Amino acid sequence: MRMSSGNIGVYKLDDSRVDYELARELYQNKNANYKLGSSFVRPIVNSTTGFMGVPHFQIEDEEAQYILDEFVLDNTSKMLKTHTDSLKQGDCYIWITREERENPLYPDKKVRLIYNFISPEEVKEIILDPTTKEPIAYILESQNEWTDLGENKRKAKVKQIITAESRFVEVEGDKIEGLEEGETPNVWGFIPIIHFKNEADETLKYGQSDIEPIEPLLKAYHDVMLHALKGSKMHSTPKLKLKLTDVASFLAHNFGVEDPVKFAKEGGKINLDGHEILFLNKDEEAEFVEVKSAIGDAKELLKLLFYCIVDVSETPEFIFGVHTPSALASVKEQMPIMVNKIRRKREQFTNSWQLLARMVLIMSKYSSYDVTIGWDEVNPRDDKELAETLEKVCCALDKALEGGFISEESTVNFLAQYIDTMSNYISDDPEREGEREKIIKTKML
Amino acid sequence: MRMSSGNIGVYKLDDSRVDYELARELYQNKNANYKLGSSFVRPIVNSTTGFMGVPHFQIEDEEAQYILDEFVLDNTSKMLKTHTDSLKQGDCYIWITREERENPLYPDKKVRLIYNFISPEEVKEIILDPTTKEPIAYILESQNEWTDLGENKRKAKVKQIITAESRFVEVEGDKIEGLEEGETPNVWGFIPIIHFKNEADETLKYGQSDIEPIEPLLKAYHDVMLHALKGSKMHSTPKLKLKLTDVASFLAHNFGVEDPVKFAKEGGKINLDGHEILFLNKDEEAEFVEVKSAIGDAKELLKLLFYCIVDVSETPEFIFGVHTPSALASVKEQMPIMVNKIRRKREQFTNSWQLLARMVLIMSKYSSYDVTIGWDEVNPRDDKELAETLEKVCCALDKALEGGFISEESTVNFLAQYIDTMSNYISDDPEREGEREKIIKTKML
Amino acid sequence: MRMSSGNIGVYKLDDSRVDYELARELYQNKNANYKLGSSFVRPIVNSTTGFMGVPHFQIEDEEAQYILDEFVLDNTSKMLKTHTDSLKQGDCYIWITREERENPLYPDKKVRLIYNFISPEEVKEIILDPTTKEPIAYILESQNEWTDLGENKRKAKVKQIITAESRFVEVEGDKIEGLEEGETPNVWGFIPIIHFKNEADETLKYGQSDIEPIEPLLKAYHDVMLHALKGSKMHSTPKLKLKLTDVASFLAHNFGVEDPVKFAKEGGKINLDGHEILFLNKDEEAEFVEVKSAIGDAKELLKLLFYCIVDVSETPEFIFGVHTPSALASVKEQMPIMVNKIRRKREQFTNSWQLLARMVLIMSKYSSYDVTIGWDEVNPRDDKELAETLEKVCCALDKALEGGFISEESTVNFLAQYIDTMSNYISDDPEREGEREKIIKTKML
């Protein structure tokens, strides 16, 4: 709606968070208030995170490219889990750490960069620069309950302040060997934590889960489903109604129920087999008390709520094709809608991935530290069609020779793109296959 | 839902575990509280585990590649079983052991690496490093009840601590010949156990079964089915109602029931056939007491619960095409949904497979220990189309010769991928055929 | 479905068995409690065992390959029956024995390896190594009732211990000429028995039948069908109702039933031809007492149970296309589902087949004893398409000659694959046709 120019309050940033425990419960269908309704959460989040894939780090420096290739080779699955965590929870925090420990399971890697997840509950507070809004300190806090290599239980409340100039850590409880209390300097002068913020908003400090828009619809769907289930349980089975001359005599004679009041008080049950025949007198009557529909219009309301859920999440209908088998007729026809959604969604994380690649390069000189994020194919391209258009361009070239030698400039780029498309396996997330194939080719020659 | 920045509890890792016995019972349709509902568990789990196949270990060192080829040749089926176990139970544990025993059944393989399964119930406790969160000890425990080669029954409670520096085993009860009590050194400085964690989450210590999201839906489906079945058994067959002048005399004359009270008390049955004729008085009446529908709306509710189950598991609709025969048509059209699900699912295990391959290589010097995991094709490629695009690329090359000799770098990689696509049989799990074809070629030359 | 870390009992191996007699009765539709329900057992097991075919033993040693070719030539049908038995019963035991007896029916084969089945009931107990869980003794027991070549009946209770170091046999009854009583040495120091274990689980000593998951559904289907059939038999035929002024006089005049009580006591029947005309007085009435539906909703419940059975067994819908004729229209479209199921199923037996081939090779020096298990085509390939892509390979090669002489390496492997896929007849189980074609080529030259 509209409003006058005045009569509007001062802008204030929101520090509210996503209630990550509830989001995880909805994702796993565990919350009792959403069990019948939260069935839609998993397909939405998982289809969205599967179709967007993982970033493909691209940089023009050969050494930086090699470092990023090694990093993705190590942590492509962790990147995909970062995507699905950000979608489910709204916030996901990635901590890059460098460990020089020597252990015999990794004799080939003296120094390793670790892709550590900080659970969003651990981040008690983020201290932002009031002007530039970038973080200047992360207040992590966790309750570590663990067991010693002996038989002793252990507990410790660890809070650690992570800042660009140093990191402080103090534990309130049992000793932890790997963490040294007190302040220790931070080797690089930046915070090595990356905040992944799904559905980031300029008026919000933290991200938003993809479940948040649909959550009231899930609640309504659960309520309608539960009401329908209870109504059917109570009334779907018709009730036999016997209008008897003497109810007590009939019960005593036919079921041995001598005291029906006590029989009802104790919840007694009359056993029936189905193949019964009724011998009544003239005045008595037997009839079934039956409902035309114990559910009423709950089916239509659930269909409307399903439509609203699909609209809000913007899920293409083939994801929910069991509801609407028409969508399964042509997935390729609907795939542009998925491409549009994934295009919109990938931009919410590419800046974070550029920051992560920049920090990885710094934490391990290079002519450039900027990275461009490539991506997996949402709608896979036909390699045969690519070769067809390649040969068509080639035969178009080498004719009307006044055009100059930019034919080489065009064809080298086309060949590079063709190799990228061909070597990247459609059904395998990331581009580890292409990197390892290049490495094997370099080794074998 | 949202919440304020404050008023949030401290993060704590969850040590809860999947009820493995219940998970197996649901998988095998054995639990009486889920028999009519747990019919969906098997298609979900088995379609997911069969479409993802088994990993293809790739490494640039030829010795490491040969070792991994031998390992997959020996233990490819156990890896598919590991996938199935991780999906069904949430947790699967693989113990790699090296055995030098000489037995006549293996005259050649003097030394063997054994792919042993630790049942998830055996793992009494996992001791984690409080900082790095990696396991530093595994507390295994099992009750071994067995028969001696004579006639004697044997029972022994064995618990063994498996640590990176040594392994300790103590057995209470009868002697076990193959296990030596007390501590013995660990020849390898790392724990040789691999923890396969399905649906791993940063806030969880153990994996989640694929049955957990659908379990309440399975329970509701079972309840609705059982209620419908009981209602139909009670009321589907219509009941003949006779309004007689005198019931007792009618029963005595027509069925010889001289004492109807005792007849009902003992549960006597009146034998009848379909062909009958009723001779009644003018005042008497005979009628059938019948239900329009003994089930009511349970069919619609079961349809809704089936939709919820299919949505939660994200199973493509052709898996349950008997419910929806439209889904059976155009399975290739629905394959991208399966491809997406398998893409997302394979990343929960690839890191564990990298660890397993690394440990196998260390257990059996190599220039590298990093293994890249390939995979079976979900939507198999057409060999003829690969040949066509190979020809198109080839004729595109050898023209506009200013491009240089990088055409070798593209065509050799394409030929490698091409031979990989051919030698790997689509219908056969893993790549045993591709490895042994090369081995037979090397032998025969 | 979750549980806390503690409050879990110790792991114990389960030695329950599959009730093989009941499984065979269900397979043969012989159990009276499953006759109307067990109709689905045969198509499930037989489709699964027929589409998976038999193993193709591949080894790189020419002599070992020849030995395995002879073995499969002898025992391909027994191998397929082993698959069927493992699926039906859960357990199948194969005993490889070597006999040097001279008989005139086999003058060409002085020494033969016999593929003997041990019925799973014969195996009283399997003694396992408590640590490695490999069997160390098989306790076989059978009641041999037979006839002498004369007129005498014979009965003997034979139990034999089969161990790696020796085999013991004792007979409690009549003499058996072929079994020398007492202990005898084992020529090879391994047990010559192979245990085929369908649906093997780490927590189960024995295998599981494919009937076990569906058995409660079969029981429910039988119960619903039997209730429906009895209800229809009782009530489908409408009952003629005559409201008469005097029933006894009517019966006496129209049917000669002078004493209706004695007529009803003896179960007398009134003969009717269908073409009757009723002459009544004004006060009397005649009407048919008829049911709208004697079955009620049993049809819908049976459809639901059929869907559950198809889901549990994971049978592709074209196997039960009589229920759903839509499936039959697109069998080729559904073949990927069958391929997935069969690919998953084959891995449960391939280790046993590798062990069997290894034992066969040992029981008859070789450079290698490891065998790779090939398989029949589930979705058969088109030979013309294979030749087409071969031509595409050939024209792609011999161009851009810097690639080297690995064209030979690729093309020889593809020619071998083409010969394999061409000579192996699709409609004939196994590869005996290709083996004898090669043998005839060698003989005739």
Dist CA C92 CA C194 (whole Å): 8
| Spatial separation of the C-alpha atoms in residues C13 and B118, rounded to whole Å | 12
The interface residues of chain A toward chain B in range 2-61, judged by CB-CB distance below 8 A, are 15-19, 22, 24, 28-30, 35-36, 39-40, 42-43, 46-47, 49-51, 53
Rounded Cα distance, A126 and A152, in Å? 35
Q: Find the helix packing angle between A41-52 and A211-235, rounded to 10°.
A: 150
Q: Are A115 and A78 in contact (CB under 8 A)?
A: yes
The nearest CA of chain C is from the CA of A30 a distance in Å of 10
C153-163 and C166-173 beta bridge pairing: antiparallel
Resolution value, angstrom units = 2.6
B331 touches chain A (CB under 8 A): no
Q: How many whole angstroms separate alpha carbon A71 and alpha carbon A65? A: 10
Residue C350, CA atoms < 13 Å, CB-side half-sphere = 31
Which CA distances in Å does A351 have to A81, A194, A347, A385? Answer: 17, 10, 7, 32
Instruction: Single out the residue of C138, C100, C137, C145 nearest to residue C118, CA to CA.
Output: C138
Instruction: Report CA-CA distances (Å) from B30 to B21, B27, B35, C215, C344.
Output: 10, 8, 6, 10, 22
Contact A198, A209 (CB under 8 A): yes
B182: left (phi over 0), alpha (psi -120 to 50) or beta: left
Residues of chain C immediately before an interruption (C to N > 2.5 Å): 364
Stretch (H or E) spanning A253:
helix A247-255
Bridge partners (DSSP) of residue B91 are B197
Inter-chain CB proximity A332 and B333 less than 8 Å:
yes
Give chain B positions within 8 Å (CB) of A50: 340-341, 343-344
Token pair 């219509």 in the structure block, residue = B238
SS3 at position B214: coil
Distance of CA B333 to the CA centre of its chain: 25
Tally the C-alpha atoms within 13 A of residue C321's C-alpha that lie toward its C-beta.
13
Cβ count within 10 A of residue A396 = 12
Say what the alpha-carbon torsion angle C214, C216, C219, C221 is, to the nearest 10 degrees. -60
A161 in Cβ contact with A137 (< 8 Å) = yes
Closest CA–CA distance from residue B105 to any residue of chain A (Å): 32
For residue B294, give the DSSP letter: S
Residue B330: closest C-alpha in chain A:
A329
Q: B259: nearest CA in chain A?
A: A253
Give the residue among B178, B210, B207, B183 at the shortest CA–CA distance from B195. Answer: B207
- Is B402 close to A423, i.e. CB distance below 8 A? no
Question: Rounded distance, CA C248 to CA C429, Å?
Answer: 73
As a whole number of angstroms, the longest Cα–Cα distance in chain B is: 113
Q: Please choose, from the candidates C49, C54, C56, C73, the residue with its C-alpha nearest in 3D space to the C-alpha of residue C372.
A: C56
The SS3 call for residue B380 is coil
Q: Touching check for B236 and chain C: CB below 8 Å?
A: yes
B439 CB within 8 Å of a chain A CB: no
Q: Is the Cβ pair B398, C396 closer than 8 Å?
A: no
- At a CB cut-off of 8 Å and minimum separation 6, what does B232 contact? B294, B295, C224, C296, C297, C298, C301
CB of C115 within 8 A of CB of C93?
no
For residue B85, the Cα-to-chain-centroid distance in whole angstroms is 5
8-state DSSP, B81: H
DSSP state of C204: B
Residues 6+ apart with CB under 8 A from C357: C55, C57, C59, C68, C71, C371
**Cα C195 to Cα C92: distance, rounded to the nearest angstrom:** 6
Specify whether the CB–CB gap between A324 and A307 falls below 8 A: no
Quote the CA–CA distance of B169 and B189 in Å, as a whole number.
18
> Residue A396: which region, alpha, beta or left (left: phi > 0; alpha: psi -120 to 50)?
alpha
Number of other residues whose CB lies within 10 A of the CB of residue C134: 12
Pick B290's closest partner by Cβ from C292, C358, C370.
Answer: C292
Minimal Cα–Cα distance from C153 to chain B, Å? Answer: 32
Strands laid side by side in the C285-289 sheet: B277-281, C239-244, C285-289
* Range C14-19 contact pairs with CB under 8 angstroms and sequence separation of 24 or more: C14/C203, C14/C204, C14/C205, C15/C205, C15/C206, C16/C204, C16/C206, C17/C90, C17/C91, C17/C120, C17/C206, C18/C89, C18/C90, C18/C91, C18/C120, C18/C206, C18/C207, C18/C208, C18/C209, C18/C212
Kind of pairing between the strands at C166-173 and C11-12: unpaired
Residue with tokens 């037996």: C349
Q: Would the CB atoms of B2 and A22 count as touching at under 8 Å? A: no
Contacts from A68-74 at CB under 8 Å and sequence distance 24+?
A68/A357, A68/A360, A68/A361, A68/A371, A69/A435, A71/A113, A71/A115, A71/A357, A71/A360, A72/A430, A72/A431, A72/A432, A72/A435, A73/A432, A73/A435, A73/A436, A73/B370, A73/B372, A74/A113, A74/A115, A74/B370
∠A117-A119-A123 over CA atoms, to 5°? 115
Structural tokens at position B439:
């081995």
Chain C residues with CB inside 8 Å of B433's CB?
A: 58, 372, 374
| Interchain CB contact of A274 with C (< 8 Å) | yes
Report the relative pairing of strands A135-147 and A123-128 from DSSP bridges: antiparallel
- Rounded to 5°, angle at Cα A262 from A258 and A266: 125
Measured between alpha carbons, how far is A249 from C303 in angstroms, rounded to an integer? 42
Q: Residue A149 and residue B132: Cβ atoms within 8 Å?
A: no
Contacts of B395 in chain C (CB under 8 A): 399
Residue whose token pair is 């073949």: C335
- Chain C contacts of A275, Cβ < 8 Å? 230-231, 234
Note whether B239 and B287 are within 8 A (CB). no
Distance CA(C356)–CA(C83), nearest Å, equals: 13
Q: Which residue has the tokens 């851009």?
A: C400
B17 to B120, B121, C5, C201: CA distances (angstroms): 9, 10, 6, 20
Residue type, A232: S
Q: Is residue A22 within a helix (H) or strand (E), and if so which, with residue range?
A: helix A20-27
Query: How many Å apart are CA A168 and CA C159, to the nearest integer?
Result: 75
B434's enclosing H/E stretch is helix B432-444
Contacts of C192 (CB under 8 A, 6+ apart): C95, C96, C97, C162, C186, C359, C363
């059917």: which residue's tokens? A232
- Distance separating alpha carbons of residues C382 and A334, to the nearest angstrom: 32
Pairing state between β C11-12 and B135-147:
parallel
Q: Helix, strand, coil shares of chain B as percentages rounded to 5?
A: 40, 20, 35
Is B131 in contact with A177 (Cβ distance < 8 A)?
A: yes
CA distance C388 to C230: 61
Q: C279 Cβ partners below 8 Å, 6+ apart?
A: none
Residue B240 touches partner C, C-beta closer than 8 Å: yes
* Tokens linked to A290: 């039956």
Long-range contacts of C243-246 (CB under 8 A, 24+ apart): C243/B280, C243/B281, C243/B282, C243/B284, C243/C284, C243/C285, C243/C286, C243/C287, C244/B279, C244/B280, C244/B281, C244/B282, C244/C280, C244/C284, C245/B282, C245/C281, C245/C283, C245/C284
Q: How far apart are alpha carbons B154 and C161 in whole angstroms?
A: 19
Cβ within 8 Å of residue C72, ≥6 positions away: C54, C56, C57, C79, C430, C431, C432, C435
Tally of CA atoms within 13 A in the half-sphere of C124 that contains its CB = 13
Distance from C-alpha of A27 to C-alpha of A46, rounded to nearest angstrom: 10
Tell me the nearest-neighbour CA distance from B261 into chain C, angstroms. Answer: 20
Contact call for residues B220 and A228 (beta carbons, < 8 A): no
C230 contact residues in A (CB cutoff 8 A) = 275
Backbone angles phi, psi at A169, to 5 degrees: -145, 135
Q: How far apart are CA B28 and CA C90, in angstroms?
A: 13
Instruction: Give φ, ψ of B255 to 5 degrees.
Output: -130, 5
Whether the CB-CB separation of C247 and B281 falls below 8 Å is answered with yes
d(CA B13, CA A412): 52
Q: Compute how many other C-beta atoms are within 10 angstroms of the C-beta atom of residue A165.
A: 12
Note whether B327 and A321 are within 8 A (CB): yes
Q: Which alpha helices (DSSP H) does C175-316 contain, by range? A: 211-235, 247-255, 260-265, 298-313
CB contact under 8 A, B237 and C227: yes
Q: In 10 A of CB A131, how many CB atoms?
A: 6
With CB atoms and an 8 Å threshold, state whether A274 touches C227: yes
Torsion sign, CA atoms A434, A439, A442, A445 = negative
